[PDB]
């Protein structure tokens, strides 16, 4: 959610109608992303600029975050392996690549794969 407008049908209870269900009204709404640009969040200048310029995507196509960048946003896994929704910056996409290549591997294949990529790994750190 981001505006009063898209949020309204969930207040009327009219949203649930698209699915042939009785009107199903809600009591309130929370806005997480929508506020990240506000004059008073500590989000850095260049970062607010980055956030805006992300084209969104309808609920129609959010599933694609799992694979490609989708509206400028990918999922990426934390150190613990739980999914995280991040802006698809260069660093984040490296993090995603390592997520798929290096961190992916069994703890047995770790140290060998690192050494065979040491030059590459060390380079991509320094760049992105």
């Amino acid at each position: 959610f981001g505006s009063a407008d898209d949020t309204y049908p969930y207040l009327t209870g009219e949203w649930s109608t698209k699915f042939d269900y009785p009107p199903m009204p809600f009591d309130g709404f929370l806005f997480g992303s929508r506020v990240m640009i506000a004059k008073e969040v500590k989000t850095s200048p260049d970062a607010k600029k980055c956030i805006a310029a992300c084209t969104g995507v309808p609920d129609d196509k959010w599933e694609q975050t799992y694979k490609k960048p989708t509206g400028g946003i990918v999922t990426v896994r934390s150190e613990m392996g739980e999914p995280i929704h991040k802006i698809a910056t260069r660093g984040v996409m490296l993090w995603k690549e390592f997520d798929e290549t290096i961190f992916n591997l069994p703890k047995n294949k770790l140290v060998p794969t690192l050494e065979a990529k040491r030059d590459y790994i060390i380079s991509r750190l320094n760049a992105d």
Binding site: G2, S3, A4, M36, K39, S44, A47, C54, G56, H85
Partner: protein, 115 residues
């Protein structure tokens, strides 16, 4: 652990990132709410008010015939949990909840809140 450790704080301090390159940085955001996020550096009071205010118009139109006179009113708003002259003598057995509702009054005012 060296890679992913403590990696949320750069979004807010790019002066300490390699060369202030946001493109190196973890920023969190939703794919669907991203489309509604456009107006940079807009005061938070505005964003929130923008939503409430907009809900208020749509609501007025639909169920109030755009007449603000039709909106019922009350002294102060809130304090509701999701669930002319008299004398109350009190005993051991008097229900506390019932008792206060009496002294509270039905009209929402200073005496209602006082009890």
């Amino acid at each position: 652990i060296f890679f992913k450790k403590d990696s949320l704080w750069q979004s807010e301090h790019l002066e300490a990132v390699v060369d202030q390159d946001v493109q190196r940085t973890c920023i969190l955001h939703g794919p669907v709410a991203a489309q509604f996020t456009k107006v940079i550096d807009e005061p938070i009071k505005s964003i929130m008010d923008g939503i409430h205010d907009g809900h208020i118009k749509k609501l007025l139109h639909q169920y109030y015939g755009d007449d603000e006179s039709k909106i019922p009113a009350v002294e102060y708003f809130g304090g509701e949990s999701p669930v002319d002259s008299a004398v109350f003598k009190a005993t051991s057995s008097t229900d506390e909840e019932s008792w206060f509702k009496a002294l509270a009054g039905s009209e929402i005012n200073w005496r209602h809140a006082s009890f």
